Amino acid sequence: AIPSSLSINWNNYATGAYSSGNAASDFGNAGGWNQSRSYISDGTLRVTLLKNALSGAGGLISNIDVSDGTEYELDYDVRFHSQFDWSRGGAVGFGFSIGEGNTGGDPGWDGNGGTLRMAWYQTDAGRVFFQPYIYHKDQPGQYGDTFGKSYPSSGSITKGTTYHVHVYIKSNTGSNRDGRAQIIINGTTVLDTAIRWTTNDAQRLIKNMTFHTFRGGSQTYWQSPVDSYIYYDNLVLRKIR
Ligand SMILES: O=C(O)[C@H]1O[C@@H](O[C@H]2[C@H](O)[C@H](O)[C@H](O[C@H]3[C@H](O)[C@H](O)[C@H](O)O[C@@H]3C(=O)O)O[C@@H]2C(=O)O)[C@@H](O)[C@@H](O)[C@@H]1O
Ligand SMILES: [Ca+2]
């Protein structure tokens, strides 16, 4: 399966290990999955973020290939551990890839793709929030563009609190800015902006659904000395057009 729609809630599972074959079962395919980092706590998907490590070394980075399209949406629930250590931040939740799915320090300035993902950050003063993490044709930096948005707008997200993310993406056409990146958290729009993902109409299309959970960042201070847990539930992916 290279699906076009998925409805996972993990209720059919015993509290215990979650397999990469379990992953491919519920997902149709699961690229770089690491079952040492998955587990099924009380009917929720628990990814683990291990101590003293960053990025893929410490987290889970799978790309679920999905039926190509031009408009896609997904909804998911996510809950940081009640005793979680925020630290500086990292990537969280389900996102979309377009064309070459530009990540890393690889900006989509060539016009050949990008991503639409979310992160959490904590400022020097300690405000903690959700933020957009985008890669597109016109992203200002080497790294992901946040459009200076944050959820909440003021104050902080809080540990153990279930947030419902709605993600929505629409391929643009040619060199026009007729694309879309939309992110709604608990009913509030964080981001709803026209965007120019790509300028090469061959990488124009949405190709797969990212599942990228990790700390960092790449500097040493994004890390954390304990192992850490993030819980997911009730994912509904759906191809639109
Ligand atoms: O303290 C900071 O805010 C610090 O962040 C640095 O930029 C980060 C950027 O925030 C982002 O976190 C990003 O995350 C990467 C990570 O590098 C790694 O590449 C992972 O493979 O991919 C993530 C992603 O796909 O982009 O990486 C940037 C990085 O610097 O690590 C800088 O802005 C730093 O100066 C700033 O003070
Ligand atoms: Ca569930």
Buried b (16+ CB within 10 A) or exposed e, 105-120: eebbeebbbbbbbbbb
Q: Residue 154: which residues within 8 A CB-CB, separation 6 or more? A: none
217 lines ligand 1 (CB under 6 A): yes
Identify the DSSP state of 148: T
Instruction: Determine if ligand 1 sits within 6 Å of the CB of residue 101.
Output: no
**Domain spans, the chain:** 5-239
Q: Does ligand 1 have an atom closer than 6 angstroms to the CB of 177?
A: no
Residues linked to residue 94 through DSSP beta bridges, in sequence order: 211
CATH fold group of domain 5-239: Jelly Rolls (2.60.120)
Q: What is the structure's resolution, reported in angstroms to one decimal?
A: 2.8
Method: X-ray
Pick from 169, 138, 13: nearest CA to 22: 13
SS3 content of the chain, % helix, strand, coil (to 5): 10, 45, 45
CA 63–ligand 2 middle distance (angstroms): 21
If you measure from the C-alpha of residue 227 to the centroid of ligand 2, how many angstroms do you get, rounded to a whole number?
23
Whose atoms come closest to the Cα of 61: which ligand? 1
144 Cβ closer than 6 Å to some ligand 1 atom: yes
For residue 151, what are the β-bridge partners? 130
